[PDB]
Design a binder for this molecule. Structure first.
Ligand SMILES: Nc1ncnc2c1ncn2[C@@H]1O[C@H](C[C@@H](N)CC[C@H](N)C(=O)O)[C@@H](O)[C@H]1O
Length: 251
DNA sequence: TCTAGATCTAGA
DNA sequence: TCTAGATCTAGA
């Protein structure tokens, strides 16, 4: 099992067993919500189309892929004992938000992700990263995970676009895995309309003989959205207990 | 999961 | 010129 080099919300590292068994085979894997890319790092497709709405994330991935050794050496400088304090963190955060250089931003982005509070990724409406200091004892520099990512990235294209645009790139030799933001159990958030729209696009792709796999919480709403797919309940219970749902659209 | 402080939006 | 109610900000 390969780990992502980024802390990221909704990481599918724990559920990789259930995903890979229910994920159809193909020449290309399309991830509209790639995030940290746990599935991409733990599968073996000939090529990938990885997309996300986060421009900083996609920019980082392009840098790591194209300028690997240069990035690792630069990013390694920031993972020293002297940088693990609030005053240094907040200046680096400010440097990140004021930087117009993709490389420097990518370098700082990794630091902020590993030194920031709970590994959060949060922006204000000005597009400024505003996650406070994390106060970790010893942040880990994912050098091994970085090189493995860049190695696998050689067969992947990265795009900063919404799910509708990325799924439109899917061909007949493609498989689509969708990991959208979690549906609510009970602004800027991923809306219920978008949750329903995702299933609708999934219905269109399978009608075009393109396999689509979707993962989400197991709720009454998700069962309604994915009612045209074979439903597979994963028990990772985690005051109520929440199961996960794998919705497969097989042609 | 929170919340004090600042800002937004409408009532013509 | 208010400001209730709802967002937004960011951990200071
Ligand atoms: N409309 C959108 N279109 C495409 N991606 C989005 C959209 N909204 C949110 N996202 C991204 O979808 C991702 C959701 C993550 N939970 C995915 C995690 C990913 N599966 C991983 O293993 O790391 C986030 O990175 C979002 O930035």
């Amino acid at each position: 099992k390969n780990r992502a080099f980024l802390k990221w919300a909704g990481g599918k590292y724990p559920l990789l067993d259930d995903i890979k068994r229910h994920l159809p085979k193909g020449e290309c894997l399309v991830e509209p919500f790639v995030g940290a890319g746990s599935v991409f790092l733990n599968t073996d497709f000939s090529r990938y189309i990885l997309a996300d709405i986060n421009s900083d994330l996609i920019s980082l991935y392009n840098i790591v892929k194209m300028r690997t050794d240069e990035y690792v050496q630069a990013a390694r400088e920031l993972f020293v004992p002297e940088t693990n304090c609030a005053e240094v963190y907040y200046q680096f955060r400010e440097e990140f938000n004021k930087s117009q250089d993709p490389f420097r931003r990518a370098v700082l982005f990794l630091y902020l992700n590993r030194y920031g509070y709970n590994g959060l990724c949060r922006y204000n409406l000005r597009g400024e990263f505003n996650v406070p200091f994390g106060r970790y004892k010893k942040p880990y520099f994912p050098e091994a995970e970085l090189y493995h990512f860049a190695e696998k990235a050689q067969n992947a294209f990265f795009y900063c676009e919404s799910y509708a645009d990325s799924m439109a790139r899917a061909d007949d030799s493609s498989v689509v895995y969708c990991d959208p933001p979690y549906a609510p159990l009970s602004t800027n958030s991923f809306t219920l309309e978008q949750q329903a729209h995702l299933a609708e696009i999934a219905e269109g792709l399978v009608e075009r003989h393109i396999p689509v796999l979707i993962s989400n919480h197991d709720t009454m709403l998700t069962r309604e959205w994915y009612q045209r797919a074979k439903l597979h309940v994963v028990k990772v219970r985690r005051r109520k207990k929440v199961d996960e749902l794998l919705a497969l659209y097989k042609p």
